[PDB]
Amino acid sequence: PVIKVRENEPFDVALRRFKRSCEKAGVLAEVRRREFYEKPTTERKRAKASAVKRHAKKLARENARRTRLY
């Protein structure tokens, strides 16, 4: 996130630009992931539960798209 302040730019623009690239490059969640040791059991289980979360919610959103509520 090496960000140079452009010429005639307000500081609140560049700070908001700096928050954007750090969320883009994934810095805060990377260090928080490496703060403690995660077992290869815990890493394989959390990644598998993340896939079922991305899949059954896709099926729940499409099933709720069909039928009405009132």
């Binding site: 996130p1 560049a14 700070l15 700096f18 810095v27």
Partner: protein, 117 residues
């Protein structure tokens, strides 16, 4: 005191404390202040307000070196990740660069075990 015009602001924003260090472009440090050194303790010193007065102390200590331009390297995750450079602008410094310099290994040394809290 030798006057210097441009400078580098290192910010070591951890979870427990924020360390602000004004240095030159060579790494020879000019002055520093920490959030724990700003009259705060424990839960109070791990706050984004603690860092933005830590930047005010640190900018006051390099007043005599005559700094007008300053670029900022930011290291670590913390509450003073953002609130430091707001007050560091508020000292009257024309900002130049905001670089993110957190150390990221490519799965190097093993981190400690998880806190069973």
């Amino acid at each position: 005191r030798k006057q210097v015009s441009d400078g580098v602001a290192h910010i070591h924003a951890s979870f427990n404390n924020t360390i602000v260090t004004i240095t030159d472009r060579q790494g020879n440090a000019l002055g520093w202040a920490t959030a724990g050194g700003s009259g705060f303790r424990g839960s109070r010193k791990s706050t984004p307000f603690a860092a933005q007065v830590a930047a005010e102390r640190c900018a006051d200590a390099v007043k005599e070196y005559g700094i007008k331009n300053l670029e900022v390297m930011v290291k670590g995750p913390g509450p003073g990740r953002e609130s430091t450079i707001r007050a560091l602008n508020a000292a009257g410094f024309r900002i130049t660069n905001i670089t993110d310099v957190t150390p990221i290994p490519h799965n190097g040394c093993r981190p400690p075990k998880k806190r069973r809290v």
